[PDB]
mmCIF file of N, CA and C in Angstrom:
data_model
loop_
_atom_site.group_PDB
_atom_site.id
_atom_site.type_symbol
_atom_site.label_atom_id
_atom_site.label_comp_id
_atom_site.label_asym_id
_atom_site.label_seq_id
_atom_site.Cartn_x
_atom_site.Cartn_y
_atom_site.Cartn_z
ATOM 1 N N UNK A 1 -25.062 36.794 6.980
ATOM 2 C CA UNK A 1 -24.996 37.866 8.070
ATOM 3 C C UNK A 1 -23.499 38.294 8.307
ATOM 4 N N UNK A 2 -23.339 39.288 9.260
ATOM 5 C CA UNK A 2 -22.000 39.703 9.506
ATOM 6 C C UNK A 2 -21.194 38.721 10.494
ATOM 7 N N UNK A 3 -19.973 38.963 10.583
ATOM 8 C CA UNK A 3 -19.034 38.137 11.312
ATOM 9 C C UNK A 3 -18.788 38.807 12.667
ATOM 10 N N UNK A 4 -19.269 38.199 13.826
ATOM 11 C CA UNK A 4 -18.973 38.755 15.125
ATOM 12 C C UNK A 4 -17.397 38.725 15.363
ATOM 13 N N UNK A 5 -16.932 39.595 16.243
ATOM 14 C CA UNK A 5 -15.451 39.767 16.354
ATOM 15 C C UNK A 5 -14.775 38.523 17.013
ATOM 16 N N UNK A 6 -13.502 38.337 16.712
ATOM 17 C CA UNK A 6 -12.733 37.284 17.442
ATOM 18 C C UNK A 6 -12.407 37.541 18.832
ATOM 19 N N UNK A 7 -12.357 36.653 19.699
ATOM 20 C CA UNK A 7 -11.933 36.963 21.140
ATOM 21 C C UNK A 7 -10.403 37.193 21.195
ATOM 22 N N UNK A 8 -9.987 37.913 22.315
ATOM 23 C CA UNK A 8 -8.558 37.921 22.568
ATOM 24 C C UNK A 8 -7.819 36.683 22.467
ATOM 25 N N UNK A 9 -6.663 36.746 21.919
ATOM 26 C CA UNK A 9 -5.794 35.609 21.772
ATOM 27 C C UNK A 9 -5.859 34.840 20.455
ATOM 28 N N UNK A 10 -6.975 35.084 19.746
ATOM 29 C CA UNK A 10 -7.213 34.391 18.505
ATOM 30 C C UNK A 10 -6.867 35.123 17.279
ATOM 31 N N UNK A 11 -6.339 34.385 16.251
ATOM 32 C CA UNK A 11 -6.039 34.915 14.897
ATOM 33 C C UNK A 11 -6.779 34.138 13.982
ATOM 34 N N UNK A 12 -7.133 34.824 12.806
ATOM 35 C CA UNK A 12 -7.744 34.108 11.690
ATOM 36 C C UNK A 12 -6.596 34.079 10.637
ATOM 37 N N UNK A 13 -6.484 32.818 10.095
ATOM 38 C CA UNK A 13 -5.480 32.600 9.041
ATOM 39 C C UNK A 13 -6.006 31.814 7.900
ATOM 40 N N UNK A 14 -5.278 31.830 6.769
ATOM 41 C CA UNK A 14 -5.757 31.127 5.598
ATOM 42 C C UNK A 14 -4.716 30.102 5.161
ATOM 43 N N UNK A 15 -5.062 28.866 4.961
ATOM 44 C CA UNK A 15 -4.028 27.821 4.757
ATOM 45 C C UNK A 15 -3.582 27.851 3.202
ATOM 46 N N UNK A 16 -2.689 26.931 2.844
ATOM 47 C CA UNK A 16 -2.143 27.040 1.513
ATOM 48 C C UNK A 16 -3.171 26.468 0.451
ATOM 49 N N UNK A 17 -4.283 25.974 0.872
ATOM 50 C CA UNK A 17 -5.426 25.549 -0.013
ATOM 51 C C UNK A 17 -6.471 26.634 0.060
ATOM 52 N N UNK A 18 -6.236 27.745 0.620
ATOM 53 C CA UNK A 18 -7.308 28.794 0.667
ATOM 54 C C UNK A 18 -8.370 28.634 1.647
ATOM 55 N N UNK A 19 -8.186 27.747 2.655
ATOM 56 C CA UNK A 19 -9.150 27.569 3.714
ATOM 57 C C UNK A 19 -8.911 28.349 4.939
ATOM 58 N N UNK A 20 -10.076 28.958 5.424
ATOM 59 C CA UNK A 20 -9.865 29.760 6.606
ATOM 60 C C UNK A 20 -9.758 28.925 7.934
ATOM 61 N N UNK A 21 -8.914 29.216 8.816
ATOM 62 C CA UNK A 21 -8.859 28.521 10.048
ATOM 63 C C UNK A 21 -8.404 29.504 11.101
ATOM 64 N N UNK A 22 -8.531 29.056 12.400
ATOM 65 C CA UNK A 22 -8.439 29.923 13.522
ATOM 66 C C UNK A 22 -7.362 29.361 14.457
ATOM 67 N N UNK A 23 -6.530 30.267 14.973
ATOM 68 C CA UNK A 23 -5.371 30.068 15.806
ATOM 69 C C UNK A 23 -5.575 30.610 17.136
ATOM 70 N N UNK A 24 -5.416 29.784 18.209
ATOM 71 C CA UNK A 24 -5.565 30.268 19.590
ATOM 72 C C UNK A 24 -4.237 30.361 20.174
ATOM 73 N N UNK A 25 -3.707 31.517 20.424
ATOM 74 C CA UNK A 25 -2.363 31.622 20.913
ATOM 75 C C UNK A 25 -2.201 31.620 22.396
ATOM 76 N N UNK A 26 -3.330 31.464 23.098
ATOM 77 C CA UNK A 26 -3.200 31.123 24.533
ATOM 78 C C UNK A 26 -3.071 29.617 24.725
ATOM 79 N N UNK A 27 -3.750 28.881 23.861
ATOM 80 C CA UNK A 27 -3.760 27.397 24.015
ATOM 81 C C UNK A 27 -2.721 26.670 23.090
ATOM 82 N N UNK A 28 -2.121 27.467 22.140
ATOM 83 C CA UNK A 28 -1.249 26.851 21.111
ATOM 84 C C UNK A 28 -1.975 25.753 20.385
ATOM 85 N N UNK A 29 -3.241 26.101 19.857
ATOM 86 C CA UNK A 29 -4.076 25.195 19.185
ATOM 87 C C UNK A 29 -4.642 25.897 17.914
ATOM 88 N N UNK A 30 -5.128 25.055 16.951
ATOM 89 C CA UNK A 30 -5.855 25.573 15.837
ATOM 90 C C UNK A 30 -7.228 24.804 15.714
ATOM 91 N N UNK A 31 -8.155 25.355 14.883
ATOM 92 C CA UNK A 31 -9.353 24.698 14.738
ATOM 93 C C UNK A 31 -10.115 25.370 13.563
ATOM 94 N N UNK A 32 -11.079 24.610 12.958
ATOM 95 C CA UNK A 32 -11.788 25.154 11.898
ATOM 96 C C UNK A 32 -12.865 26.091 12.217
ATOM 97 N N UNK A 33 -13.601 25.812 13.399
ATOM 98 C CA UNK A 33 -14.737 26.562 13.800
ATOM 99 C C UNK A 33 -14.312 27.993 14.269
ATOM 100 N N UNK A 34 -15.089 28.932 13.809
ATOM 101 C CA UNK A 34 -14.790 30.286 14.314
ATOM 102 C C UNK A 34 -15.244 30.504 15.802
ATOM 103 N N UNK A 35 -14.258 30.846 16.586
ATOM 104 C CA UNK A 35 -14.510 31.116 17.969
ATOM 105 C C UNK A 35 -15.514 32.380 18.279
ATOM 106 N N UNK A 36 -16.262 32.190 19.339
ATOM 107 C CA UNK A 36 -17.200 33.368 19.738
ATOM 108 C C UNK A 36 -16.910 33.817 21.000
ATOM 109 N N UNK A 37 -17.124 34.964 21.355
ATOM 110 C CA UNK A 37 -17.315 35.528 22.675
ATOM 111 C C UNK A 37 -18.652 34.954 23.262
ATOM 112 N N UNK B 1 -17.639 19.826 7.049
ATOM 113 C CA UNK B 1 -16.388 19.150 7.189
ATOM 114 C C UNK B 1 -15.334 19.460 6.180
ATOM 115 N N UNK B 2 -14.055 19.182 6.471
ATOM 116 C CA UNK B 2 -12.873 19.537 5.782
ATOM 117 C C UNK B 2 -11.960 18.307 5.662
ATOM 118 N N UNK B 3 -11.128 18.258 4.697
ATOM 119 C CA UNK B 3 -10.103 17.335 4.588
ATOM 120 C C UNK B 3 -9.038 17.615 5.657
ATOM 121 N N UNK B 4 -8.932 16.786 6.608
ATOM 122 C CA UNK B 4 -7.957 16.746 7.580
ATOM 123 C C UNK B 4 -8.176 17.810 8.703
ATOM 124 N N UNK B 5 -7.396 17.925 9.707
ATOM 125 C CA UNK B 5 -7.280 18.935 10.705
ATOM 126 C C UNK B 5 -6.832 20.180 9.968
ATOM 127 N N UNK B 6 -7.018 21.378 10.610
ATOM 128 C CA UNK B 6 -6.275 22.507 10.097
ATOM 129 C C UNK B 6 -4.866 22.428 10.355
ATOM 130 N N UNK B 7 -4.109 23.396 9.612
ATOM 131 C CA UNK B 7 -2.613 23.287 9.900
ATOM 132 C C UNK B 7 -2.307 23.371 11.378
ATOM 133 N N UNK B 8 -1.252 22.744 11.758
ATOM 134 C CA UNK B 8 -0.786 22.854 13.190
ATOM 135 C C UNK B 8 -0.490 24.254 13.587
ATOM 136 N N UNK B 9 -0.617 24.468 14.900
ATOM 137 C CA UNK B 9 -0.316 25.842 15.431
ATOM 138 C C UNK B 9 1.134 26.109 14.983
ATOM 139 N N UNK B 10 1.405 27.443 14.743
ATOM 140 C CA UNK B 10 2.747 27.871 14.403
ATOM 141 C C UNK B 10 3.712 27.934 15.609
ATOM 142 N N UNK B 11 4.158 26.810 16.004
ATOM 143 C CA UNK B 11 4.923 26.652 17.297
ATOM 144 C C UNK B 11 6.302 27.292 17.220
ATOM 145 N N UNK B 12 6.797 27.430 15.971
ATOM 146 C CA UNK B 12 8.136 28.162 15.937
ATOM 147 C C UNK B 12 8.051 29.547 16.546
ATOM 148 N N UNK B 13 6.811 30.107 16.550
ATOM 149 C CA UNK B 13 6.504 31.504 17.122
ATOM 150 C C UNK B 13 6.697 31.509 18.685
ATOM 151 N N UNK B 14 6.949 30.330 19.268
ATOM 152 C CA UNK B 14 7.152 30.243 20.716
ATOM 153 C C UNK B 14 8.647 30.552 20.935
#
């Protein structure tokens, strides 16, 4: 199914092994799980 | 699951 949008403050990045991860610029944190509204 | 945590936050951007 489709991808719901990212919430404010979050960025989607890809690491040097090709793995998607998510960056929270409000918290200055990263995580694997896609955030949801 | 994944090998390791994800890359650290890009703190130099602060």
